Each structure stands twice: as C-alpha cells, then as structure tokens.
Design an enzyme around this catalytic site. Structure first.
Site, PDB file in Angstrom:
ATOM      1  N   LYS A 214       0.821  -1.222   0.000  1.00 39.00           N
ATOM      2  CA  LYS A 214       0.000   0.000   0.000  1.00 39.00           C
ATOM      3  C   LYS A 214       0.845   1.258   0.000  1.00 39.00           C
ATOM      4  CE  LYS A 214      -3.751  -2.174   2.460  1.00 39.00           C
ATOM      5  NZ  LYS A 214      -4.366  -2.197   3.817  1.00 39.00           N
ATOM      6  N   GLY A 372      -2.422  -6.669   9.070  1.00 36.86           N
ATOM      7  CA  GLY A 372      -3.116  -7.885   8.657  1.00 36.86           C
ATOM      8  C   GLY A 372      -2.271  -8.905   7.917  1.00 36.86           C
ATOM      9  N   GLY A 395      -1.510   0.059   9.502  1.00 39.36           N
ATOM     10  CA  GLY A 395      -1.619   1.468   9.143  1.00 39.36           C
ATOM     11  C   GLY A 395      -2.110   2.299  10.318  1.00 39.36           C
TER      12      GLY A 395
END
Ligand SMILES: Nc1ncnc2c1ncn2[C@H]1O[C@@H](COP(=O)(O)OP(=O)(O)O)[C@H](O)[C@@H]1O
Ligand code: ALF
Ligand SMILES: [Cl-]
Length: 414
Positions: A214, A372, A395
């Site tokens: 990400k 995760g 995050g």
C-alpha cells in the site's frame, strides 16, 4: 480511551448492538489463511451476548472493491463460517448491508442472534470515493452518503466500535453511525492501552520498518513519523518509489506511486535535518509476472530492473544492512513485509528480517509487528509469542505514531 464511553460501561441488556469490526483477513484462493483479526473481536461479541444483548450486528470490510460489488472475490461469506467455530454459535449471513430488506432482518431479531452484514465497500458511500466500471475514480454524492449512515443506524440501539485495524479511516461505518451512545470495544481498549505505554516514552534508538504493497497511502505517514523515530528501514513496494526519484533508477514493472514521488526529496532532507538514518535496499529478487510461479531474476540499484520485470523481494546484501539497523535499536515497529512472503521464491528476505527481530527481543529490545499481512508472517513462522506484541492494525498503529488522534476514536461518545 480514558474519557470516552466503553463497552464495560455500556448497558446492552435487551438492546440491539451494531458493531464495527475489522474482519479484513487474508485470503488465498477464496479461503482464510489467518483468523487473528476475527479471533481478536470475540471477547467483545460474547460480552454482549452474555450480558443479555438482544442481537449483535457486525459490520466490516474486505479488501478494496473500489465501491463496486464483487461477491465472487471480495465477499464476507467465508468469514462468517469461521465465526461459528470461534463463536460456538450460529451466525447468520446477509448479502447486503443495506437497507429495507436488510433492515427487516435487523429490525427486531430473535434473542442471542448475531448477524454478519455484507461487505461495506460494495457501496461508494463507505469510503466514500471509488472506481466505476470504466476504472474512473469517482466520489459519492453528499446526500447519498448521508442516507447510507441513516441506514446503519436502524440496525442497532447502541453502537460499539471494535475495529482498531481501520480506526485510522474516517469512513461511514467508523464515524457515521448516529446513535446516542457510541462505545469503544475491548480490542480497541486493549490495543490503545498497549500503544500508550509503548509510544509516549519510547526506548531509543527507535526504529520503524516500512514495507508492504500500500504505497500511495503509507508515504503520507512518513513525514510525521520522521519527528518521532531515530531510524527508518523503507523496503517492500515502498522502495521503488524512493529509488526512482533519488537515483533515477530503473524499476521495471514495480509498484510506483506518482503522487508519492513528489515528496521523496523533502522526506530525505527532513530525515537529514533531524538525523534519522534511512535504510533502503541495494539489491532485489525479480520476477517477469506477478506470480508464485514466475521466472526469477536478480538485480541491484546500480544494475536497475529490466523492462517488464518487477522486484517482489529484497536481496541478501539488503538484508545485511537491515540487520545492522535492528541490532542498534531498542524499540522496533514493523508494518508491511519487505517481500511477498506468501510465495516461496520471494519469502527469503522477510524471513531473514523476522529472524533478526526475534533475537532482538531476546536482548530486551521491544518489538511491535502490526498489520493484517505482516501479522500473518508471525502465524506462518510461529513467532507470535516470540515478539513483544503482535497487533491487529498496521496502518492504524503508524498513525498513532505520528501524533494525530484516530478518526474512529475521536467519534466515540464522551
Ligand atoms: N511489491 C509487492 N507486491 C505485492 N505484495 C508485496 C510486495 N511487497 C511486499 N508484499 C507483501 O506485502 C503484503 C502487503 O500487505 P499490507 O496490507 O501492506 O500489510 P499490512 O496488512 O498493512 O500489515 C502483501 O500481502 C505481500 O505479502
Ligand atoms: F493491510 Al494493513 F495495516 F494496511 F493491515
Ligand atoms: Cl495505498
């Protein structure tokens, strides 16, 4: 925390409970690979059932379906199945989270009943921005967004928020449910407490390891992180965005964030200004397609990555450097793997890194691995009780590290 309503202070007897959870679990080939995130939310769910709660309605999201519905891929029905096992109770799964049909079921259920609503990210009103069929990014209408939130509020009499993992996002489930009483779950509390101890007075040197896929989201965090840490390892998909700007390197088909690339220089210079050592990869392991079973290849920063090839893991010289950083540090926060740990050809680097993080905890260094996918490393290699803490949010944990309060927590009652 501390001045906001909590589940233990909440009265749930005879009342329906709408609960936000982070059930965004890892999937391979349509099946669950880790259930910690699910397993972590059970204490809160049971509490309600044991205290005489009429129903518990569960809302969550899976992946990034970009505002369009993908039941074939990003469905929450398999989840859903695990919950029964951990639960020990019959769980009832619905194919939408709204409205009149869904509201019908949730309007007054049978006693002790738990319901899993469908994935929230099938609607543009969650985020609320998304992609249409074209792939054109669009935003949801203000009026519709607001109808979305009124829909959720008929699903329960009290609201409980347990999704620590998404607490950093100001989405409609997280901040939008308008109910008189909005209470934080145990996972939220357990997690928030742990990080108030860890941050606020960090052991130094403090190192932050950055990785994952990400890129676009996680670079924007860096800047405020630079004010709180002493060292930073930036590997994983992040690495290429940095290296192309900094050295006009060639990165092939690797993940690139263009907007992120606009701030790379400033981020380096602030690191200098503050004296934060930034560690990057010097060599990679490469692949010709995004596949477990792709042809493998080798590369350097100097060599560059060949056109149509991508770097899915970091090389042995790179792991050598990271390991120097780990040895120096007395607190470590790690989010995002440095490579694709799920596929055996690209799990070399991540494995090495964890191995070092485990020794580090032996000499009394404090280690937090959060997220995760980054958590799933622990489960895969059985290092869960070998590190100081394993956290459900990645995050979210980094956003606590910057200093901003979380959108999810600021929206709880006072
Ligand atoms: N270049 C790359 N491309 C794809 N996956 C990569 C990767 N580099 C590392 N990975 C690994 O990073 C993982 C990204 O997961 P994330 O959600 O960012 O981590 P979190 O949940 O926040 O802790 C992905 O599963 C793959 O194993
Ligand atoms: F997938 Al994450 F923190 F971004 F767990
Ligand atoms: Cl992103």
């Amino acid at each position: 925390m501390s001045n906001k309503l909590t589940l233990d202070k909440l009265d749930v007897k005879g009342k329906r409970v709408v609960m936000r959870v982070d059930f965004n679990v890892p999937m391979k080939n349509n099946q669950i690979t880790n259930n910690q995130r699910i397993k972590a939310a059970v204490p809160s769910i049971k509490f309600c059932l044991d205290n005489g709660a009429k129903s518990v309605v569960l809302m969550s999201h899976l992946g990034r379906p970009d505002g369009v519905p993908m039941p074939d891929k990003y469905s929450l029905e398999p989840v859903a199945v695990e919950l029964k096992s951990l639960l020990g109770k019959d769980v009832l799964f619905l194919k939408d989270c709204v409205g009149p049909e869904v509201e019908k079921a949730c309007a007054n259920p049978a006693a002790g009943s738990v319901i899993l609503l469908e994935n929230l990210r099938f609607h543009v009103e969650e985020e609320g921005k998304g992609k249409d069929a074209s792939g054109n990014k669009v935003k949801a209408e203000p009026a519709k967004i607001e109808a979305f939130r009124a829909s959720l509020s008929k699903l329960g009499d009290v609201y409980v928020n347990d999704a620590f993992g998404t607490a950093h996002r100001a989405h409609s489930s997280m901040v939008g449910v308008n109910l008189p009483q909005k209470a934080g779950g145990f996972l939220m509390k357990k997690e928030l407490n742990y990080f108030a101890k860890a941050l606020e007075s960090p052991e130094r040197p403090f190192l932050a390891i950055l990785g994952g896929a990400k890129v676009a989201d996680k670079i924007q965090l860096i800047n405020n992180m630079l004010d709180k840490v002493n060292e930073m390892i930036i590997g994983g998909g992040m690495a290429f965005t940095f290296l192309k700007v900094l050295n006009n390197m060639e990165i092939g088909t690797s993940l690139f964030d263009e907007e992120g690339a606009k701030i790379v220089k400033d981020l380096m210079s602030k690191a200098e200004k503050n004296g934060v050592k930034i560690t990057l990869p010097v060599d990679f392991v490469t692949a010709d397609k995004f596949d477990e079973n792709a042809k493998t290849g080798q590369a350097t920063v100097a060599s560059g990555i060949p056109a149509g090839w991508m770097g899915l893991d970091c090389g042995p010289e790179s792991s050598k450097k990271y390991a120097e950083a780990v040895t120096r540090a007395k607190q470590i926060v790690w989010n995002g793997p440095v490579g694709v740990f799920e596929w055996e050809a690209f799990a070399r680097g991540t494995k090495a890194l964890m191995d070092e993080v485990v020794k580090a905890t032996s000499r009394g260094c404090i280690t937090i691995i959060g997220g995760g996918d980054t958590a799933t490393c622990c489960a895969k290699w059985n290092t869960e009780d070998k590190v100081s803490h394993v956290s459900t949010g990645g995050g979210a944990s980094l956003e606590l590290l910057e200093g901003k309060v979380l959108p999810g927590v600021d929206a709880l009652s006072n």
